[PDB]
Symmetry: none
């Protein structure tokens, strides 16, 4: 029986728009935890993000929708899905439509800490590729995560 | 109401090396939801690597006819060849990285039982996709993944 809730840190993130994941951008998200409240059809996301160089913590709440989709507001409108889940990893696929109306598909490999299992990385790279996102559009987040645990 | 939980029974492939153990298409279905209003399909299942189970949640979009496009270990295009209350036969065309096309078939169920007639319709749809009877593997025998 898989436990999806608990501690989750971001390892890598891929994006179809490089403007959304660079330094201090809205989507260079350093995850800390995700909680799935299936009874109340919600999801609780806690993470850090840099703005003007300093770490800023977030606590959002998303509502479960059609299929395995999750709706959440943050730098536009998001609809994310957990494309993969194993005892060591979680791979999220997300679609953002910012305030301007531009659509960006993103992906992320989350884990239990700073130690990556290449098996989960290959799956993450395979999902990223399927979303038509190129390898040069992948950023290592563990090397950039200097925010508080 | 062809929407609900569906477990894999048998799977047949034109490349036997794809449905083998620790292989990508050795899929242990859990649920399939068909959203007609929004024109989409939702697959929820497991697979295996180094003996460990891995959950997958995919989204596919309806196309011309009854074909659906969904990404998983390459680009797929499947059809629900047959659909009754006890079974769901799926024909699938997978095109991986190398561009290596593979034809597949899957018999889905509700629990542990398999009716002789659905099993039969499955073998008939299989032979119809140009797939040898040898290339059929029993998938419920090895489904020890979580419920």
């Amino acid at each position: 029986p898989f436990e999806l809730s608990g501690k989750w840190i971001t390892s890598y993130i891929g994006s179809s728009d490089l403007e959304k994941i660079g330094e201090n951008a809205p989507f260079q998200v350093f995850m800390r935890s995700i909680e799935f409240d299936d009874k109340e059809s919600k999801v609780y996301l806690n993470f850090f993000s840099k703005e003007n160089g300093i770490c800023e913590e977030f606590s959002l709440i998303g509502t479960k929708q059609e299929g395995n989709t999750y709706d959440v507001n943050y730098a536009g409108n998001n609809k994310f899905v957990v494309s993969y889940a194993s005892e060591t990893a979680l791979i999220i696929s997300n679609i953002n439509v910012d305030e301007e109306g531009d659509k960006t598909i993103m992906t992320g490999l989350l884990g239990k800490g700073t130690d990556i299992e290449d098996q989960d990385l290959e799956k993450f790279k395979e999902v990223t590729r399927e979303n038509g996102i190129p390898e040069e559009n992948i950023v290592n987040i563990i090397e950039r995560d200097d925010c508080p645990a």
